[PDB]
Nucleic acid binder design. Structure first.
Lengths: 154, 114, 53, 65
RNA sequence: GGCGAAGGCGAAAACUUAGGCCAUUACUGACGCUUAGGCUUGAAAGUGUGGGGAGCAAAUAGGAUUAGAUACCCUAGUAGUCCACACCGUAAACGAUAGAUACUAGCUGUCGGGGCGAUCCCCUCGGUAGUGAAGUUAACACAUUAAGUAUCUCGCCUGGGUAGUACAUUCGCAAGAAUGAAACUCAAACGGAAUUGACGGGGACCCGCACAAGUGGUGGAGCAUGUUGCUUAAUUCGAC
């Protein structure tokens, strides 16, 4: 019966001083190693740089912040069915899912180099066009039939 | 137009049916779970009662209402959500009326639900 | 039952009187026998007498 | 404070006790038991008969209040 | 909490009515209890007549699950609910304790009655109960409201399936109930209570990558092997 427990998160990168990009490195690394992911990610900050003149800090923050939920549909089952009760989702899991969704969407639209696509997805999440904002949208819009579930506890 | 009327809500055990009526009990509007799209089984939920009550409160009030009676009948799981919605609707009420069946005895209900 | 008290908390007082009306009328909505009616009523009565008082 | 078998006149049927009945039975239509007012077997049976007769007198409504 | 024989009894009004609770120095005088006889009721189901039926519902129709639903679940409906009439006679009609019977710790009561004061706390006798002494029970426990203990009477049993079966009768307009074997026939127990578990589609309770989040993938496909199968010449056998 696991209870509240801490997490190990690498401290912010000296060149940008953001802990969020560090969790991105934590969760993007191919073959489970940073010996190779960091080069291309710094390239991506560069690609963001000469494309649309977006400084990585503000564009990355405005991309990650707009994909973040506020509702925890806590599971409660009947052993033959299941339902969800809406509580407040934890803030640590808030930022965790935000960064995970940003990273996992960041690497798609298979094309000539991953630099162009990752900068493209950073820009898309920056401009609030539908590529990862849909996560935040659904986490509140599908909690409407589940909003009825907030009238009772089971 | 009309300065006085009534709103009858009925929370039957698995349905929410409501009508806004004239002071002589002549309906000017009505709503039910099916009219909202809750036809079937989701009409027993408090959400259907709350949405029905909100809709009819708006229809009776924005029409030109000042003071209205609220006749609540039946018992379900959303008869309290209904009055909460009326309170949140913004319609003047002097007191909530109780029209629930309160007999000593009477007709015999259906067979034992097991 | 008069509920003309205030403009925002009338339903809160309505809750308790509705609960009383329910608990007095929670047995006339189904078919049943006299024996189980008396059994449940008297058992609930002597159970409330022993725990809450 | 106990209300009957505590100030009880032993004769509670209709004798000018209308206000007491309107206070014994709260305006929410409920006859008080021996568990609150404390009336004895004598007092409680006579109060019950008197109140149901007042119900059959329309002084206190059967189901309204 | 009271009353009523258990059967049961609660919107009221009234009708008649009895049992009853205390105090009756008293009113009499062994009538005191008793069951086979004899005398009555006995719920409800159900039988039948007429109305009447607001209502629902046995059987039944349909929809649902289902291997099917005579099931759970729902929409109807027949009698079934009502009124009076009669019948009905079994019941968890269970003090699972026959009647009355005579008193027996305490205990908290609680109600009614008689003396008291402001209703109250007070004494007493009866109605409503058990914690528990003694007594009595396989153990729980009855225990001042006996399963304690005196008196009498009566019915109910001698292990089981068989079996409330045939037989003969009874009452019952019906439905049903009354009546009750024999043969076969077994070695003790859905025996009874009582201690540890066993599941629970019972709670409560303590933690665990037990779960979730994930990483990272299986499976889809492409390699090598593992098992088993087949098979000839053996594809050795073994884990099930």
């Amino acid at each position: 019966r696991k209870n509240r427990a801490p997490k190990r998160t690498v401290l912010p990168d000296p060149v940008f001083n953001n802990t969020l990009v560090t969790r991105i490195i934590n969760v993007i690394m191919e073959d489970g190693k940073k010996g190779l992911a960091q080069r291309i990610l710094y390239g991506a900050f560069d690609l963001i740089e000469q494309r649309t003149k977006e400084k990585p800090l503000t564009v990355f923050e405005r991309a990650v912040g707009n994909v973040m939920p506020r509702l925890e549909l806590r599971v409660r089952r009947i052993a033959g069915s299941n339902y969800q009760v809406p509580t407040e989702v934890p803030q640590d899991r808030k930022i965790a899912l935000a960064l995970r969704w940003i990273a996992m969407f960041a690497r798609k639209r298979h094309e000539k180099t991953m630099l162009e696509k990752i900068a493209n997805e950073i820009i898309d999440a920056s401009n609030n066009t539908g590529a990862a904002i849909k996560k935040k949208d659904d986490t509140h819009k599908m909690a409407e039939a589940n909003k009825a579930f907030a009238h009772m506890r089971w | 137009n009309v300065s006085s009327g009534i709103i009858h809500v009925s929370c039957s055990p698995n349905n929410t049916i409501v009508s806004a009526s004239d002071p002589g009990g002549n309906v000017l509007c009505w709503a039910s779970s099916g009219t909202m799209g809750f036809k079937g089984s989701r009409k027993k939920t408090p959400y259907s009662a709350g949405i029905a009550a909100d809709k009819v409160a708006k229809t009776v009030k924005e029409m030109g209402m000042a003071t209205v009676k609220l006749f609540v009948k039946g018992t379900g799981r959303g008869k309290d959500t209904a009055i909460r919605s009326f309170a949140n609707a913004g319609l003047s009420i002097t007191e909530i009326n109780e029209k629930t069946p309160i007999p000593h005895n009477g007709c015999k209900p259906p067979k034992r639900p097991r | 039952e008069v509920k003309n008290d205030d403009l925002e908390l009338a339903l809160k007082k309505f809750k308790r009187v509705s609960l009383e009306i329910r608990r007095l009328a929670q047995r006339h909505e189904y078919h049943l026998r006299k024996g189980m009616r008396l059994r449940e009523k008297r058992k609930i009565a002597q159970k409330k007498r022993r725990k809450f008082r | 404070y106990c209300r009957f078998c505590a100030i009880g006149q032993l004769r509670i049927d209709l004798i000018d006790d209308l206000e007491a009945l309107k206070r014994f039975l709260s305006p929410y239509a409920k006859i008080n038991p021996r568990r609150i007012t404390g009336n004895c077997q004598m007092h409680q049976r006579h109060v019950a008969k008197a109140l149901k007769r007042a119900r059959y007198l329309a002084l206190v409504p059967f189901v309204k209040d």
